[PDB]
Design a protein around this ligand. Structure first.
Ligand SMILES: Nc1nc2c(Cl)cccc2s1
Length: 167
């Protein structure tokens, strides 16, 4: 049993809810929250910008030190950093950004990072300002992630379309 409430069950291991991920993290304090990161961990807007704002910029400060030591992530890659006030850990995952011309086949590699964690609160990778089709992102998630994933969808309209169209 876990703390997640109000989710629709899509499969054995994938759950979905219309919820503001910043507000969901604050309520649940999950072991892992996933950030929709870029390779520079520059959390300016989107999921990254919203989560970073909720940490009072502490996520960005920590991220800048990580990049100064390690250099940029790979598209499809990830790193584990602090969850600050939102979670124990934040898994920063880089899905491909279609608005930069990145290979959408890298979306499966991105979701494979989730399999290193037994339970996660996450957004749909490469959705929103990363430009991918969220219906596609949900299909790749279901077909790739084997651990227990609780997906948060900000847009009520999109949430209802993801559920109604789910095979
Ligand atoms: N507070 C929140 N901001 C966002 C943004 Cl900017 C994108 C996607 C989901 C959420 S939840």
């Amino acid at each position: 049993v876990n703390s997640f409430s109000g989710y629709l069950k899509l499969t054995d291991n994938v759950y979905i809810k219309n919820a503001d991920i910043v507000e969901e993290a604050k309520k649940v304090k999950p072991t892992v929250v996933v950030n929709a990161a870029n390779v520079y961990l520059k959390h300016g807007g989107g999921v990254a910008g919203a989560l970073n704002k909720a940490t009072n910029n502490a996520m960005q400060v920590e991220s800048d030190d990580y990049i100064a030591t390690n250099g940029p992530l790979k598209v499809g890659g990830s790193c584990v950093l602090s969850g600050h006030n939102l979670a124990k850990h934040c898994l920063h995952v880089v899905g491909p950004n279609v608005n930069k011309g990145e290979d959408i086949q890298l979306l499966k590699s991105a979701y494979e990072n989730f399999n290193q964690h037994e339970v996660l609160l996450a957004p749909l990778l490469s959705a929103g300002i990363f430009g991918a089709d969220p219906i596609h992102s949900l299909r790749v998630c279901v077909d790739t992630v084997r651990t227990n994933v609780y997906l948060a969808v900000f847009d009520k309209n999109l949430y209802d379309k993801l559920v109604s169209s789910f095979l």
